[PDB]
């Protein structure tokens, strides 16, 4: 085994060889030279990240105040309009004309139900809606089990028809506005503009079971947040059909709950235990509810019935005050069949003043006495609900919000506050969106205070979407580098706006569906959960980020600079990036907005080119017939002008881009000058490289392909044969290697993938990249990332000439940080190239981490898909490992032993690059396995919830809670 100085001297002649090959062939110092040679085609402006945040915080203020004004007027009209409605019952005499969504639009149908008359609308196709729509009226959604033509429903479509004039007045004023909808108390919803619903009832074989009342946006503006506590009778009598019904009501009751709502679930049969692991009221987020809905299911019923230990346990649960709580409506609901005891004594003290509200549910078909339960409900200002059937569950476990809304409708105007929802997928397929809601109240005869019998309910709730693609147009990231971004946050820790946030729903648990019990054609529910990713789950968690995260939940302003490690774009690397954060509150709302920058991004380039010939000359550089002397040029699909659209077929896009500058001068009076201009300047900078430097050295021996991925989207792979293999995203702010090249001050090597499809190994090769780094007036800039795809065959020859091509004595390999295998001596390893090195000899890799040579961090990706397990895709959690050098020390000697054998490995790290060289004795001499240490998205179901909630994340609830008005009717059950 060679000495430590021989490995030292032999690494230094093959890290000097790779870097000279990459410093020379790519042209780092040449592209630095021509950015500095000009100085005057551009100027260098600063990103004032105090100022940028303040500017952004105000476009989201004004956007969400403009939405709010529209909401207020609609509400006023609805209140005024229905106070002048007459309650007619002759509807076959005077037809109600409306367009009904989810109905066949074929003219020849003509069903013509009594009372109603439909509309055939004309349906232009649209952008900002990715569906055909009509701007002349509002559609109407009736849920499926609700009959339309009922006097109760027919009378909504009469009075609600005056909203189409106010609907129209909102979009005339603001073209950008998205869905406008009124969700009725009656269960009928009207939205503008009209479009056909996505599931028709019976024209396909999937049938929608969508109810407006059920909806989260409808619920948050229906009522105030609430600490509930589900109390269930588990005595022997319940077992049977009735027990079956309860498990489906509680799961149903929960659907109703929200993040702001706290909830626990207890259960009694002569003792009250608590159904799961929790013991206090927990946040009823997606996870906690998933635990409770998984413990409600396994319940078995036996024993007697004591309504006294069940309500003692409930009240005690209600009084914890140590835990984090909603502290608003306090209510307890019991599911039971029949009661012989009213438990008068427990209610006298625990709730002598009736602070708590009790709702009693009688379920199943049975003969047990319901008088005592009704009495309990009446005594406590709750309500009573029967459920005999499965189809009766859905409208009675949502109906309690008519009771809880009462002291809000007695609060008057004070209760008309806009609230904005958690991001969620739109019913109509719009994408991620948030809705601002306002409740409409039933005011009839207010002038004189004549009735009030049913004047304590809301007419319904009114909402208006903001799409998250609308907010991302108020937070522009182009001036800032790929590293910089804006993050938005609730007072709940959830992230409103984040690079990491994705359309797929956030998943819980490992998905298990039983194929042996899905009959083929019945169509179960798909999903309704909100997409609540948290800030400490969108990014790698620190302790110096939980400080930042708490500090901008409680509405403060500030900046912070620290060293933290960024997870890479692809999930394979972790790079220590020195960042600066800066946050401020959006003053109209409860969102607070932040901005990450990396020091060195504090300055950007603005293009200062305006000459006729210079913008002209740089623009034919990106012509696809002129790639024989330029290099297969790419171009990023920014929204350059409003007219040319991002196309995802890039040769399509670059023609429509470059047609645009010929057919019209780049002045373009409805199109931003700087973004297009910067691109033009850039293409004259990645031209002078490809003309005056790369086309001189037309073939370097080991060099396969040469790229300049730059800022302005223009990536230039140098031979067109090589550009067929360029499998990157052509958007330069989505490339992984672009972003890892900017963090590092040394050449970076990217490992090719293992297996997969497409040619990514011998054909393209392993790639090196390096950020260009210029200084203008003593101000650091990193404009571009040069690079090289390496030839893996040639590199091997230099490497071979104490390791032989076929050596049994000892094997040596080169590994980039992250532990991936790039170059291998054996030839059974270099076939499996770009593979995680702990999968080809897991014994050595395990030891290396122990020596402190390597470090890692497992994280959770709450938005990913996986195949089900037997117990096409669902959402699930994956755990993800990344590996990264944590020790700066250059060399590491030692020996590892498996038991009865030693192997002496020597590790040396090449200077000036992330690569590491290790020499070790052949694996075959000691037959050892430990277990195969693998690095992949690995399906898992963590972290366990029962341990998170003992020390929950900081949170801030709603300031205004409406409950317990003294003059509430409290007489109807």
């Amino acid at each position: 085994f060679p000495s430590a100085v021989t490995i030292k001297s032999w690494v230094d002649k093959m890290q000097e060889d790779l870097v000279t090959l990459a410093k020379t062939a790519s042209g780092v110092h040449q592209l630095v030279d021509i950015y500095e040679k000009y100085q005057d085609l551009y100027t260098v402006e600063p990103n004032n990240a105090r100022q940028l945040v303040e500017i952004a915080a105000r476009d989201i203020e004004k956007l969400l105040s403009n939405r709010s004004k529209a909401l207020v007027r609609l509400a006023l009209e609805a209140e005024k309009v229905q106070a002048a409605h007459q309650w007619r019952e002759d509807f076959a005499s005077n037809e109600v004309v409306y367009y009904n969504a989810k109905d066949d639009l074929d003219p020849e149908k003509n069903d013509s139900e009594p009372g109603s008359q439909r509309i055939k609308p004309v349906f232009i196709d649209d952008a900002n809606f990715r569906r055909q729509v009509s701007y002349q009226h509002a559609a109407v959604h009736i849920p499926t089990d609700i009959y339309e033509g009922s006097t109760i429903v027919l009378n909504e479509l009469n009075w609600t028809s005056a909203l189409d004039d106010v609907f129209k007045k909102n979009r005339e004023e603001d073209p950008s506005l998205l869905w406008q909808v009124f969700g009725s108390a009656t269960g009928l919803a009207r939205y503008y503009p009209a479009s056909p619903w996505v599931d028709n009832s019976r024209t396909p074989n999937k049938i929608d079971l969508y109810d407006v009342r059920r909806r989260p946006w409808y619920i948050q503006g229906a009522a105030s947040p609430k600490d509930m506590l589900i109390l269930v009778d588990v005595s022997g009598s319940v077992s049977g059909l009735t027990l079956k019904l309860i498990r489906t009501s509680v799961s149903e009751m929960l659907e109703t709950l929200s993040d702001d709502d706290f909830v626990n679930v207890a259960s009694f049969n002569s003792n009250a235990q608590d159904v799961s692991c929790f013991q206090h009221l927990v946040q009823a987020n997606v996870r906690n509810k998933k635990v409770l809905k998984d413990a409600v299911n396994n319940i078995t019923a036996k024993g007697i019935t004591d309504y006294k230990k069940g309500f003692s346990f409930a009240f005690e649960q209600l009084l914890n005050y140590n835990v984090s709580r909603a502290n608003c409506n306090k209510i307890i609901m019991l599911f039971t069949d029949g009661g012989e005891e009213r438990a008068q004594e427990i209610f006298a003290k625990y709730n002598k003043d009736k602070k708590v509200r009790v709702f009693t549910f009688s379920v199943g078909q049975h003969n047990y006495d319901r008088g005592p339960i009704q009495w309990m409900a009446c005594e406590n200002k709750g309500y009573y609900y029967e459920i005999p059937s499965i189809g009766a569950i859905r409208i009675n476990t949502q109906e309690y919000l008519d009771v809880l809304g009462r002291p809000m409708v007695l609060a008057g105007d004070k209760a008309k506050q806009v609230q904005w929802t958690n991001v969620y997928l739109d019913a109509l397929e719009l994408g991620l969106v948030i809705t601002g809601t306002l409740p409409v109240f039933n005011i009839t005869g207010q002038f004189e205070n004549k009735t009030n019998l049913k004047n304590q309910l809301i007419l319904g709730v009114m909402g208006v979407d903001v799409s998250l693609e609308d907010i991302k147009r108020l937070t522009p990231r182009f001036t800032l580098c790929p590293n910089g971004y804006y993050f938005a946050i609730d007072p709940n820790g959830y992230v409103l706006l984040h690079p990491n946030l994705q359309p797929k729903p956030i998943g819980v648990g490992i998905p298990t569906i039983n194929l042996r019990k899905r009959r083929p054609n019945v169509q179960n529910p798909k999903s309704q959960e909100p997409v609540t990713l948290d800030f400490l789950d969108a990014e790698l968690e620190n302790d110096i980020k939980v400080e930042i995260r708490n500090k901008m939940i409680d509405g403060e302003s500030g900046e912070k600079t620290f060293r933290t490690l960024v997870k890479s774009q692809d999930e394979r690397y972790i790079d220590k990036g020195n960042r600066t954060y800066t946050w401020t509150p959006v003053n109209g709302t409860d969102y607070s907005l932040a901005l990450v920058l990396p020091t060195y991004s504090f300055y950007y380039i603005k293009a200062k080119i305006e000459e006729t010939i210079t913008q002209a000359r740089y623009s034919e550089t990106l012509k696809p017939d002129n790639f024989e002397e330029s290099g297969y040029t790419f171009l990023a699909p920014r929204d350059y002008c409003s007219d040319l659209k991002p196309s995802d077929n890039n040769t399509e896009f670059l023609l429509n881009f470059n047609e645009f500058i010929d057919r019209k001068t780049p002045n373009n009076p409805s199109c931003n000058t700087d973004l297009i201009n910067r691109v033009l300047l850039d293409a004259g900078f990645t031209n002078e490289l490809v003309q005056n430097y790369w086309s001189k050295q037309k073939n370097i021996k080991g060099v396969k392909a040469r790229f300049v991925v730059t800022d302005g989207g223009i990536t230039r792979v140098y031979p067109k044969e090589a550009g067929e293999n360029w499998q990157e995203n052509p958007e330069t702010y989505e490339d992984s290697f672009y972003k890892r090249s900017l963090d590092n001050d040394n050449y970076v090597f990217t490992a090719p993938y293992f297996n997969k499809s497409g040619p990514g190994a011998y054909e393209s090769g392993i790639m090196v990249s390096k950020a260009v780094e210029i200084y203008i007036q003593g101000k650091l800039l990193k404009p571009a990332v040069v690079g090289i795809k390496i030839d893996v065959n040639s590199w091997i020859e230099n490497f071979t000439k104490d390791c032989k091509r076929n050596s049994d004595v000892m094997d040596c390999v080169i590994l980039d940080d992250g532990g991936f295998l790039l170059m291998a001596n054996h030839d059974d390893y270099t076939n499996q190239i770009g593979r995680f090195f702990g999968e080809i000899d897991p014994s050595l890799m395990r030891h290396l981490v122990n020596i402190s040579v390597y470090a890692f961090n497992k994280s959770y990706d709450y938005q990913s898909v996986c195949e089900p397990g037997a117990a096409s895709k669902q959402s699930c959690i994956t755990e993800q490992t990344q590996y990264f050098f944590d020790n700066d020390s250059k060399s590491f000697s030692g020996v590892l032993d498996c038991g009865n054998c030693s192997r002496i490995f020597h590790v040396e790290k090449l200077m000036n690059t992330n690569l590491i060289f290790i020499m070790v004795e052949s694996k075959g001499t000691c037959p050892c396995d430990t277990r195969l240490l693998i690095q992949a998205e690995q399906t898992s179901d963590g972290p366990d919830p029962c341990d998170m909630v003992k020390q929950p994340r900081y949170r801030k609830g709603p300031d205004v809670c409406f409950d317990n008005n003294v003059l509430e009717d409290y007489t109807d059950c």
Binding site: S239, G240, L241, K244, Q365, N367, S389, I390
Partner: protein
């Protein structure tokens, strides 16, 4: 005991005296007696020892 977790209704049981009287009379006329017996058998696990 006719407390099976199904939504099927079994009107002929022995839950109280009047109902039990009717069921006995029914088994006596022989009308649907086998159906009544099946319920009773299922109330003890099924067709086992």
């Amino acid at each position: 005991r006719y407390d099976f977790e199904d939504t099927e209704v079994r009107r002929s049981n022995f839950d109280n005296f009047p109902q039990a009287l009717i069921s006995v009379f029914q088994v006596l006329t022989g009308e649907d007696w086998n159906s009544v017996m099946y319920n009773g058998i299922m109330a003890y696990g099924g067709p086992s020892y």
